[PDB]
Design an enzyme around this catalytic site. Structure first.
Site, mmCIF file in Angstrom:
data_model
loop_
_atom_site.group_PDB
_atom_site.id
_atom_site.type_symbol
_atom_site.label_atom_id
_atom_site.label_comp_id
_atom_site.label_asym_id
_atom_site.label_seq_id
_atom_site.Cartn_x
_atom_site.Cartn_y
_atom_site.Cartn_z
ATOM 1 N N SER A 57 81.497 87.086 21.693
ATOM 2 C CA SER A 57 80.699 85.985 21.805
ATOM 3 C C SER A 57 79.215 86.629 21.353
ATOM 4 O O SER A 57 78.336 85.953 20.546
ATOM 5 C CB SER A 57 80.281 85.661 23.150
ATOM 6 O OG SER A 57 81.345 84.913 23.780
ATOM 7 N N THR A 101 35.893 64.659 -1.362
ATOM 8 C CA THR A 101 35.743 65.844 -0.704
ATOM 9 C C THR A 101 34.936 65.773 0.674
ATOM 10 O O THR A 101 33.732 64.968 0.507
ATOM 11 C CB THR A 101 35.122 66.881 -1.699
ATOM 12 O OG1 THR A 101 33.801 66.587 -1.956
ATOM 13 C CG2 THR A 101 35.907 67.093 -3.028
ATOM 14 N N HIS A 102 35.354 66.146 1.781
ATOM 15 C CA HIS A 102 34.720 66.100 2.991
ATOM 16 C C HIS A 102 34.797 64.765 3.413
ATOM 17 O O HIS A 102 33.850 64.343 4.388
ATOM 18 C CB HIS A 102 33.215 66.595 3.251
ATOM 19 C CG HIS A 102 32.929 67.771 2.527
ATOM 20 N ND1 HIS A 102 32.843 68.986 3.075
ATOM 21 C CD2 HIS A 102 33.088 68.590 1.240
ATOM 22 C CE1 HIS A 102 32.511 70.119 2.702
ATOM 23 N NE2 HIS A 102 32.604 69.789 1.328
ATOM 24 N N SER A 149 53.881 39.277 10.018
ATOM 25 C CA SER A 149 53.367 38.178 10.651
ATOM 26 C C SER A 149 53.432 36.978 10.001
ATOM 27 O O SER A 149 53.635 35.622 10.717
ATOM 28 C CB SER A 149 52.420 38.350 11.268
ATOM 29 O OG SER A 149 51.952 37.881 12.488
ATOM 30 N N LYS A 166 48.755 42.710 6.002
ATOM 31 C CA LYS A 166 48.785 43.990 6.707
ATOM 32 C C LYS A 166 50.315 44.779 6.839
ATOM 33 O O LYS A 166 50.970 44.447 7.347
ATOM 34 C CB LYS A 166 48.397 43.506 8.246
ATOM 35 C CG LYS A 166 48.880 44.454 9.262
ATOM 36 C CD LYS A 166 47.767 45.033 9.985
ATOM 37 C CE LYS A 166 47.477 44.441 11.416
ATOM 38 N NZ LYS A 166 46.465 45.302 12.101
ATOM 39 N N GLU A 168 53.795 57.696 9.395
ATOM 40 C CA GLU A 168 53.798 57.597 10.829
ATOM 41 C C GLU A 168 54.909 58.520 11.304
ATOM 42 O O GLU A 168 54.750 59.490 12.121
ATOM 43 C CB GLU A 168 53.644 56.331 11.697
ATOM 44 C CG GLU A 168 52.328 55.990 11.454
ATOM 45 C CD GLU A 168 52.483 54.354 12.082
ATOM 46 O OE1 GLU A 168 53.296 53.701 12.338
ATOM 47 O OE2 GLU A 168 51.209 53.581 11.432
#
Ligand code: NA
Ligand code: NA
Ligand code: NA
Ligand code: NA
Lengths: 457, 457, 457, 457
Positions: free
Chosen positions: B136, B183-184, B314, B320, B327
């Site tokens: 084992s 940037t930022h 929808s 949308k 995700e």
């Protein structure tokens, strides 16, 4: 059969109770093998049960539908639909796909309970009836809180209390067994085996209180916040009503969250609860480790404890007892530490009105609760209750050590005491033998002056 | 039926192929719900297959038993015994209980294949035949390495290469689309959408090379180290023979570990491989995040990209599109980061001759591989292949920004350029409008001098 | 000068106040550059101050020595001996070397205060006087608890309360500003800017309560447990006396730990406190991120907020404001998450009577407290107090979105509402323009029926 | 003196060499106490040195300025300006404030070297001369890569090789010392002390190769990407020129990054390098732990090894040797594990064209390198080189164990062998005593048949 959603129709096996959207998205997310936990599915079903009851009481839902929805939810909660929830954890970050899975399964089953059929002819509508007054956005956070709180109260705390009781009974039983302390792994000042065990008991008491400190925030429910927290389109009594009904159903003081935005935009209660869980993990790691070390041998380890042998040994390999329970616990404690990081990254990563790392956060929190609860229980049942002291070995380590020499300090002074210890060490002898050799202490004096039972406070 | 081990006899359901020890210990470890992965079970079966072939070739195992063991192992590998491996991850830290599970299932099935019966009458012995020449202690490390290496080569690397090819085809297609840099999070110097995508492609190339760097150590197999690394009681040709046979079976250059002690006392190859995996996770997180941000809207976000709509919308809520693939990926990347910590704690916690945190380490490494592979593949198929630029929106952001003002520097000097930008900003106008107002630049001059297509290197 | 310990004598710079052991071991541990924090050194000095006072009151220490020790400890606490503590964090795991550093510095300085000299002639003995009644083993855990508790109460909680007050004043000021919600990064249901900010305020309230929940366990002091927890060789009144005196000195309800073994064998209070700290980190990350995203632009981002410009811009690059405070906070929140893992591994790794991962645990906990406290304060002062809404931009995003179409549902039904949204989307027009085009809604009707101010609950 | 920036003027102490922006922002970020590491400051200075040389060679910078800048950079690199870099890690996420700190200090000092003055009159301009051809955005990533690569090659790898050489010399010296193995902490099959040590040596070899695998990606430099990766406004030869010059200066094969976007938008090379570092940490943890356990006692532990006593003992407490080096190493290994999480969160959190978690990432990577390098070196010097076997104790554990009974299997069969072990166990006797008692083996037979030296492969 053919079920339908706004993209069109799709075949669903006749044997299954889910609908178009679940079936459709059972193809979009073949990611790995982790599915939503039964705990989480049950908490979602509980919300649907509560919503139906409240919506009935408010007069907005027909009694026949309400009763059929409640009955269907109860079947899910009783474990009768284990195969109707096929979706991955790795899905929509809001848990929408799983909310829809509950709505569709409950709609199809409720329809059967009303004398109807599964599928497009059903009398109960997944969105308009099962999901009435709710949003995926406020349902999933609600279910996370419920699932975590109930698992803590009903599963983890009792397991911790059982292990605590056992270790405290052991502490009491071992209160007069004097043993060598170890600090830095080295021989140190004596204490009783009971005192050492009392440490473990106190760690469990502390952990139980820390875990309990996570409950008030978990008891705060998002339900009624609707899409973004404002409660737009909710019946004005739904939030309070559902929370009271969840309270009645569970026996726990669930309440409507005073700030819906906070419990939707963030899952901070789960982050904090998991902080409590990893504190318990640190304690259990220490406890489990000490016990396996103290039971190590049978002849080349510490040898102070015997533990029960769970799995069959060799016959040629007595008395080799592998500490399987400690290994299971130490491994799952590592898992809890990892799970905390995953929860933290997710919890920290909410954007604007909704945190959409939710299925992952829930998966980790609920896993950690199960691991710690079953781990504590198994460790209790299969290890802790049968711990026995190896009294002769403990007493031999104690009296053959160099550590008891401090007892001589008042009677011959530090320098002579130190002189005896150095000589025993150098020569491989007992303290008594060296003390007699130096002529500093008679046999009778040694026995009168060196009393381990008086050196433990 | 009744099966037997050294503790005695125990009932095993007639429908199941495992034996006494699996059944016995299916009661000692009701911990949570995680079981050994199919990948790991398959790798264990592969070792049993290889051992039988080698032991046949060495003359120490009868041909009939060898052939039946090989055939049984193949059935397991083909997925035909999914329900015969019921044990938890949270078990013996060496994976012994799971090694025994393979031995018993293969012994019972091989016995059927020889015309015999399951249970105590079987012709094939779990320990003496299926486990011949093995421990084992050296089997489980071997299986960890095999399972991880094959999952990397056969599942993860191809998925990463597919996503890389797609993003590179997109980079090429978008090479002439000039957009505003950020940037930022702030408006910055322009670049092409293709250049930005080329960054993602390069991150994938780097990740693929880093993951490949983990393979040579994983290819080193413990098999033949027996109980503690020395090879005591192994046939002298078994170590080399089994490694060559695993090589032949897999197509990969597996070799006998030059130091058995190292790959038994530690699982450092898995720690390192997981370090590579979490590098890929950091890259995929960034890629997945950029894409969902760039596709955010349809009207109050960035709006530069359109992505495919997986799950039905929808009708009231066009356009949308929730970025479900991003995700799923971002969530699983969090999971990989957590899993790394669990692996690290376990890997660091070996004692003396054997690391006994192994089932947990393997569970995490193999989960991470599956998550990243299926995640990359799903992101490819359901998002990346259908990414489209919103060309009008991109060009409007570019030309209505303040950033193109630097193009004027050579023609009117820094101070006047800066003066125009400040005025556009203060007044809510375009740079062109402000430039015309100040009389510093004609309409025709602006168009000739301010050329975004010349500002990207 | 030459100082002396049991290994012999060693040169110590005349300008320094430490002694033989500190000097000796300033050569054994040149590991990296991290030294014990001033907070921790101060907490250690406080214990020495308290011990002297208590030992005076008990009659076991001469008044002149006691007074000189107290005065020396006070100088350390006032920050006057910043250069007298040169040892690394990476030292003895019990913190013994640092305990000795305090004893030697205080002995040498107290000796000067009595009219004596530094070094071998000193009137005050590091071990026999400064360390009277104490062990390194019970002093260091005590100092960890004190340092963490005081840093929490005096530094972190007030900073969090200040930021909370500011964000709540902003919430109140922005209560009537209606904006577009975002879920999954996509345009969603409206809410007020005030409501969104109220989420942040509630996260801070929750965090403050969670952090406070860590205090009772931190208030439990090991002092008096001596070597292994039993209190052997302690004066019987010392434990209670020292804890009361630490209470008097700090204003906080410190108490003697009911179980000395638990607070010596483990640092679980620090593990739990750090769990609270990483909950605050998850909240601050979200808050800091939302704010920088909402202020992104000036023209190709979200553009809803303006934030103060800390550091000088370009003149050519108006109105580019890099969100430096959010970057500092998000970075330090990452650090807190890492620090939690280091604390957890250390906390989990106690053996028998003493956890000897202590300097590392303390380094991390105290760093996390400083980072979160200074971070919250800086974010308050240099960002949050000057947050301003870009009212025209917010209102333009709101009214040019597709999201307000649900207001039409009661007046023309879902299908026509959905029809208008789809047409606006397809054509790049406002909802109003599409509604007029389809002849479904007059201009006057649109304005009467579509009221964002009535869509926020 | 008064220094000036675009916001105006500000007082800077005459004694300091920094300028307006450093001084201004030394008030905006009083966050905690961590400052940029000397390694990082030196790498930044090296870039400025290289840029000056290249810009001279290209003809765009005057020789006098170039030479003065080079000389100033060299002084920084030689450690002569330790007090001129006062900024926190917790600053602009791009490291801009620190880039400016280098530019200002070098400008002021270069000005002195040209016969000029510090401050507004200086001949050398921080931005226009010291920062010529560069952006903060491409300088900081470049410096991270350089600092990490050089610290790995010059500090860590040699320390690991030194420890490896020592443990291999010990392995060779201990090759004939037969000892009891331990698996699951329990007595197991024998191996030599040399074989056990050979495991540690192999772990170090593996770790060295894994760390080396991180170098090629670190050698890729962002310098020349300018603001967003495109190279806009860079001299066309600057990227290649600077990388070649950094190569010449360091002796390492630095190259211009084939994809600038990848090494600016992400810090994946640092994430991967840190993955290698935490693999080394897992190995060092195991090694350090085994050694302290094997040296535990002197009488109630394992007692197989003696280690050097670093810090003075008690005289009363011989031969208690606390394993301080193992404690320092195990603690810093915990720190490396935490640091990995912080790096991972930061690395994963890049947005669009620039990752702005950089000072934190660099702080952690460089700390981990220092800790592991100094830790390995200290462990080598103060522990490993003086490890000695306690030969009598090792041989007593071996021969008094139950484990050697398997040697009898060929001579009396398994059942009688197993019978002897069970009897020795039950009775507290040696195997030999039990074997003689049962009449199964003569004294002479036992000695002939039970040969530990033949049981190690
Ligand atoms: Na004396
Ligand atoms: Na000009
Ligand atoms: Na309608
Ligand atoms: Na036999």
């Amino acid at each position: 059969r053919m079920e339908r959603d706004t993209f069109g129709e799709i075949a669903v096996p006749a044997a299954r109770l889910w609908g178009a959207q679940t079936q459709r998205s059972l193809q979009n997310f073949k990611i790995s093998t982790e599915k939503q936990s039964p705990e989480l599915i049950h908490a979602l079903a509980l919300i649907k049960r509560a919503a139906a009851a409240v919506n009935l009481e408010l007069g907005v839902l027909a009694q026949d539908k309400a009763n059929a929805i409640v009955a269907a939810a109860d079947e899910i909660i009783a474990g009768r639909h284990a195969d109707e929830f096929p979706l991955a954890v790795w899905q929509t970050g809001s848990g929408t796909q799983t909310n829809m899975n509950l709505n569709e399964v409950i709609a199809n089953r409720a329809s059967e309970l009303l004398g109807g059929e599964r599928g497009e002819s059903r009398a109960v509508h997944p969105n308009d009836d099962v999901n009435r007054g709710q949003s995926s956005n406020d349902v999933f956070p609600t279910a996370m809180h419920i699932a975590a709180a109930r698992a803590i109260v009903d599963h983890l705390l009792p397991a911790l209390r059982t292990l605590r009781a056992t270790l405290d009974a052991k502490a009491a039983a071992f209160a007069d067994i004097v043993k060598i302390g170890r600090t830095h792994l080295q021989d140190a000042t004596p204490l009783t085996l009971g005192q050492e065990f009392s440490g473990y008991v106190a760690q469990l008491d502390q952990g139980i209180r820390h875990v309990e400190a996570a409950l008030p925030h978990l008891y705060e429910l998002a339900q009624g916040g609707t899409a973004v927290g404002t409660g737009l389109n909710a019946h004005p009594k739904f939030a309070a009503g559902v929370a009271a009904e969840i309270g009645r159903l569970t026996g726990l003081p669930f309440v409507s969250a005073p700030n819906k935005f906070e419990v939707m935009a963030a899952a901070d209660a789960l982050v904090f609860a998991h902080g409590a869980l990893k504190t318990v993990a640190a304690s259990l790691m220490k406890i489990a480790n000490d016990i396996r070390w103290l039971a190590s041998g049978p002849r080349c380890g510490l040898g102070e404890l015997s533990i029960p042998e769970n799995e069959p040994g060799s016959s040629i390999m007595p008395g080799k007892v592998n500490p399987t329970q400690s290994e299971a616990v130490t491994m799952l404690c590592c898992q809890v530490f990892g799970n905390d990081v995953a929860v933290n990254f997710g919890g920290a990563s909410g954007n604007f009105e909704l945190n959409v790392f939710r299925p992952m956060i829930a998966h980790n929190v609920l896993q950690s609760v199960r691991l710690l609860a079953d781990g504590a229980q198994g460790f209790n049942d299969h290890c802790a209750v049968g711990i026995e002291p190896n009294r002769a070995r403990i007493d031999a380590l104690l009296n053959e050590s160099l550590m008891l020499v401090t007892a001589l300090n008042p009677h011959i002074g530090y320098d002579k005491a130190a002189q005896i210890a150095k000589k025993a060490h150098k020569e491989g002898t007992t303290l008594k033998a060296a003390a007699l050799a130096l002529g500093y202490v008679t046999d009778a004096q040694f026995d009168e002056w060196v009393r381990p039972e008086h050196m433990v406070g």
